[model samples]
Target: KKPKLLYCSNGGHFLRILPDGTVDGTRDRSDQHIQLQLSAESVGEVYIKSTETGQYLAMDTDGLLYGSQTPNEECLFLERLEENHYNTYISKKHAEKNWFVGLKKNGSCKRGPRTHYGQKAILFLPLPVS
Candidate 1:
């Protein structure tokens, strides 16, 4: 199965990405599985076949991580749209230009309210899936 793009989870109310909009990892709780969607109205100029492992692209307009793939060789792209959630890891390239929210320790710590040192995006270089 092809690994699609999606937001890992919603950070919070203020930083949550809408289900109907272009999101990097917005999981649809419609049934049980977390699925991502793409509308016919995508404005991004990028159009290419998805990778074998998993890959994700950012929404240049909003600088949000709106794309993802499962191709092993492909790169991993994570983003925060200034919403209730922030990326688990942001690449060095994007961290320089985008406004990133600080990180919280994994597990129960993330669910708590804490001040962010800053927001950041993590970009991973994937080795194409065999």
Candidate 2:
């Protein structure tokens, strides 16, 4: 299957990882498209990676999102289908703390500490890349 674009419902932006490894939302389709790789260690867990930069999406202790060359526990996320039909990705490493992958209305990333399951900023629709 082709890679998918993560559309942020709140911002009307696509989640992308810049060449410089910064994670943010973009208004246009770019080389930052990603593939959601399933984690073999656990069911419903996934590893998000940029198809263009070949970098894995990772979350830091500060809840900041970035790209890393190597996949690690920090790059793992629990994929959940919410009641609203939008998907939510919670950092597997920080699941105990309920940290989530979120994007703001201005196309910027929202820190995990500022996110919650009910927030629209944390909801994403994975669209197929044509």
Candidate 3:
């Protein structure tokens, strides 16, 4: 499901995408950049895109996360369930590398390298509808 906010468990921030291709976490729940779309490709897989900018989440082999307009393997993620009770979005493009979307200690976002074993690989709770 497309969620209004993808809140990072690391910092209580929401994942946001800018029109200029920037992707990060913000504390602003009212930010239009926080609106996102989730399209399911299959079980354990989904394509996340920014509704405001029309860009999809993608990453490179070097673990650089960005937003792109075209759909590709990099745009797909495996929504894995963790024992910590959080959803980890592992990139389909670099599944072998175990890359996922995570936040830095400072609350900034990036493509996490390796395993999802910490708060960086924690949850992205959807905003509750009022």
Candidate 4:
């Protein structure tokens, strides 16, 4: 299947990278910033660019991820297929970055280059096609 938008399992919010550097996942699919375009930089390497802002999702030095207007090395990630049948976007820059682009328990959105894939706050569900 082709790469599609990912939503939070806990809530139905779609992941979105705001223009203000907010990596939020509470936005709806109707939101332009919430639609992620997945393309491969190479085999096993992928890039997720926002269809709304035309920005690539990148990480900062502080481990905070955001959407970048320009492409960066941090924008690269290794797509992994989890045993649960979900996809995990693992950072390619190393340092064990497996933050699952997940949501907080409060349903608030935030960048999680600091979290793990095993946490519910990090696992995300793929959008189903109609």
Model number with the top lDDT: 2
Q: What's the candidate order when arranged by decreasing TM-score?
A: 2, 3, 4, 1
Better of 1 and 3 by lDDT: 3
lDDT, candidates in the order shown: 0.28, 0.84, 0.75, 0.69
User: How would you encode candidate 1's per-residue C-alpha lDDT over 1-130 as one tens digit per residue?
Assistant: 2323433223311121233332322223332223322221123212222232222333332333333443121222233333444334332234444322221222111211232324322211111122
> What TM-score, computed on C-alpha atoms, does each candidate reach?
0.28, 0.91, 0.88, 0.80
**Model 4 poorest ten-residue lDDT run:** 94-103
Top-scoring candidate (TM-score): 2
Per-residue CA lDDT of model 3 for 92-120, tens digit only, reads: 87777767888765667765573354555
In candidate 2, what are the lDDT values of residues 1-130, reduced to their tens digit? 3577888999798888877889998887654454434343468888888878888889999899998889978998998999889989999988988899999999899999899879999999988886
Error of 2 at 71 (Å): 0.2
Q: Between candidates 1 and 4, which one is better according to lDDT?
A: 4
RMSD from true fold, candidate 1:
11.8
Ranking by lDDT: 2, 3, 4, 1
Relative to the true structure, candidate 3 reaches a TM of 0.88
Model 3 CA RMSD to the hidden true structure, in angstroms: 2.0
Stretches of candidate 2 exceeding 4 Å from the true structure: 30-41
- C-alpha RMSD by candidate, in order: 11.8, 1.8, 2.0, 2.6
